[PDB]
Amino acid sequence: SCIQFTRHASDVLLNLNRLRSRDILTDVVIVVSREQFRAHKTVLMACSGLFYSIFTDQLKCNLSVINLDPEINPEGFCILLDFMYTSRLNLREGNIMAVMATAMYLQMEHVVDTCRKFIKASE
Amino acid sequence: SCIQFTRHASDVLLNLNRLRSRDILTDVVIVVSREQFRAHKTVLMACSGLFYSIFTDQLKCNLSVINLDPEINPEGFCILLDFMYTSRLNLREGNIMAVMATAMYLQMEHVVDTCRKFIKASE
Amino acid sequence: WVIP
Amino acid sequence: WVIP
Ligand SMILES: CSc1ncc(Cl)c(Nc2ccc3c(c2)CC(=O)N3)n1
Ligand SMILES: CSc1ncc(Cl)c(Nc2ccc3c(c2)CC(=O)N3)n1
Ligand SMILES: [Cl-]
Ligand SMILES: [Cl-]
Ligand SMILES: [Cl-]
Ligand SMILES: [Cl-]
């Protein structure tokens, strides 16, 4: 018999992004080919199967720095980190291959699906 | 020129609630008349003007325990904590006064508005 | 607010 | 996915 507030999830995510932009309560640095990205472990886990596995590990959960595979493109990661905090994906002809490869590595199934569909349309 | 995934914010919140239910990466205990509630500081800040003010304070941001005002009802708090993580509010005739008072204290403007409207309908 |  |  609950009532539901339609915009609540969107409003929560908007505030989480405001905390990220002001670097408030960020608890991890993600290192991608020397580029560094500050984020909230909980948001990363909520969006990515790879971060979920990393931060539920009894040893890795305590790390303040996570280094990604050297093949990961920093721009692809940045676009995906923006998507995690906003639901908006900046998908372009020039970045789609790097975005799909990063989403496959991060285990972000819905992003992988839209990239596959956009690539299939261009062939 | 971004694309947007409609269900992303809802999916993020659902995963944050799954982390709460398994007590994963919770970083604060909220004490309400001896009852204790574990939560994520970021989610509390994203939902409440009071928690936002508390955890942006240079001294309070580092506290692992927050004690609420003794007038706060633990059931009212529990209903609101569930709303923060799910967008669902368990509003009932028997709890509406405690829920409205707790939402006013927590500075959760949308909850206060729906309680005021539901109370006005009953008079 | 809605009935979910 | 939609055009926001
Ligand atoms: C599976 S239970 C669960 N509980 C809590 C969290 Cl934080 C979580 N995240 C997560 C796991 C897998 C995947 C994603 C998020 C996005 C994706 O495409 N795959 N999962
Ligand atoms: C105002 S900028 C901002 N930036 C980040 C966060 Cl985490 C935040 N939360 C917050 C502040 C005030 C209120 C709420 C949340 C819910 C409500 O009714 N009032 N606000
Ligand atoms: Cl470390
Ligand atoms: Cl995804
Ligand atoms: Cl403490
Ligand atoms: Cl609210």
d(CA B16, CA A122): 36
Q: Is B109 in the pocket of ligand 2 (CB under 6 A)?
A: yes
- Across the beta sheet with A28-32, the strand order is A35-39, A28-32, A65-67
Task: Name the method of structure determination.
Answer: X-ray
**Best substitution site from B42, B48, B52, B80 to test ligand 2's pocket, by max atoms within 8 Å of Cβ?**
B52
SS3 content of chain D, % helix, strand, coil (to 5): 0, 25, 75
Structure tokens at B90: 């368990």
**Helical pair A8-21 and B8-21, crossing angle rounded to 10 deg:** 80
Question: Can you tell me the distance from the alpha carbon of A37 to that of B94, in angstroms, rounded to the nearest whole number?
Answer: 47
Q: Which ligand is nearest to the CA of A29?
A: 3
CATH at residue B111: 3.30.710.10
Neighbours of ion ligand 4 (CB under 5 A): A 108, 110-111
Final resolution, Å = 2.0
Q: Residue A61 gets which letter from DSSP?
A: G
Residue B20 structural domain: 1-123
Q: How many domains does chain B have?
A: 1
